[PDB]
Amino acid sequence: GMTSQLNELVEFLHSPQPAVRQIAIDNLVGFSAGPTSKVFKNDSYRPIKDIIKMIMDPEHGTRVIIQQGVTILVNLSEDKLVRNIILSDDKKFLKFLVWKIVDLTNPNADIMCILLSNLAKDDGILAVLNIKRNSSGEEVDDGLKLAALNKEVFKSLRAMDCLMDCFVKGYDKKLTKYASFNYLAFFFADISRFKLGRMYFIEEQEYDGVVPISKLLVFTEKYDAKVRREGVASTIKNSLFDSETHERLLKDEKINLLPYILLPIASAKDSEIDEEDMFNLPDELQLLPEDKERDPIPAIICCHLESILLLCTTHAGREYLRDKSVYPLVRELHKNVENEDIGELCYRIVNMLMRGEP
């Protein structure tokens, strides 16, 4: 019935005629969500391969065809086995994808960021850290016409550097009218789970001489972009996996890590901290606006509390946190937010900060 119709239809994705393909994918895009999507897994994932070729085709890959192909791939990238095909079957696609996001004339940038964030679960995503290009202008990389970079915006030839630039400077449609790059937050979140990924975020990069994690910190207070807050929260937590890195990161004043972990758990109104404690708080936590509130999403608060808890691993870290009135902030969070997961974490932090010197 429908299964029989779709099996025949999917094969037209590799018809030699462009007109035929354009029609085939137009009809198929609707069936990529829900039980009918099994059809895209025929011939050991041949439809996925054909769709990838259609997207990358420089002549016949129109705006609509790219949008429909990516929309399919976003839906199908829930399956782990499909993500494998997207990354490993053709190594060109990942290069194509990241470079087309940083193309500020690409109208399908955001939908592509969603695809990228889904692919970041598979550890084959680490390839992004090595994807560079020879020149700033137009270039042919393994038969791919890469668009010329905006030299005014992107100073790096590294892909990961340029994606950071898009996220940090492109929020609220500031680089492109078509996109705000929000879902790159989830890309950074999932890639920083891996060792080599964490290492990008906590080390100086040449192109702008800064430690990337610092550039994301400001977005913990971005209360009109829930996706950004969630991803950045996880990236910070994942960046702190190594105890021995904690002293360096807390004390680097150019990074200025701690205040942006604390701000989302701080409130002006529902919080009584005496003035002795308040004088030890970081500058950014003192004289808070009257309307200053905690992040309303408990999942995000818990993530920040997990970061604080990580920092409590080492004695030097515990001393740093104590000296910045982290205890009173945690106490008042506990007092004023009924959530039970938040509460459990608050006690675990206090248990740690109660320790002396080993």
Q: 312: phi > 0 → left, psi -120 to 50 → alpha, else beta; which?
A: alpha
**How far is the C-alpha of 29 from the C-alpha of 66, rounded, in Å?**
11
Extract the runs of DSSP E, i.e. beta strands, from 11-77.
none
**Reported resolution, Å:** 3.0
- 32, 170, 233, 99: CA torsion to nearest 10: 50
**How far is the C-alpha of 154 from the C-alpha of 130, rounded, in Å?**
17
The values of phi and psi at residue 260, to 5°, are -80, -15
Q: 42: phi > 0 → left, psi -120 to 50 → alpha, else beta; which?
A: beta
Number of other residues whose CB lies within 10 A of the CB of residue 342: 21
Specify whether the CB–CB gap between 148 and 136 falls below 8 A: yes
- Angle 175-177-181 (CA atoms, 0-180°, nearest 5)? 60
Beta bridge partners of 158: 132
Beta bridge partners of 293: none
Question: For residue 253, what are its two tokens?
Answer: 């004043």
Token pair 């945690």 is found at 330
Number of other residues whose CB lies within 10 A of the CB of residue 109: 23
- Angle 210-302-260 (CA atoms, 0-180°, nearest 5)? 30
DSSP SS3 for 358:
coil
**How far is the C-alpha of 7 from the C-alpha of 13, rounded, in Å?**
11
**How far is the C-alpha of 174 from the C-alpha of 304, rounded, in Å?**
28
**How far is the C-alpha of 34 from the C-alpha of 208, rounded, in Å?**
44
Burial 20-42 (b: 16+ CB within 10 A, else e): ebbebbeebbebbeeeebebbbe
In order of 99, 116, 266, 298, 300, the CA distances from 269 in angstroms are: 46, 40, 9, 18, 20
Which three-class secondary structure string do you get for 249-273?
Answer: HHHCCCCCCHHHHHHHHCCCCCCCC
Specify whether the CB–CB gap between 323 and 354 falls below 8 A: no
For residue 302, give the nearest of 350, 341, 261, 266 by alpha carbon. 341
130: containing domain = 1-358
Domain count, the chain: 1
Method used for this model?
X-ray
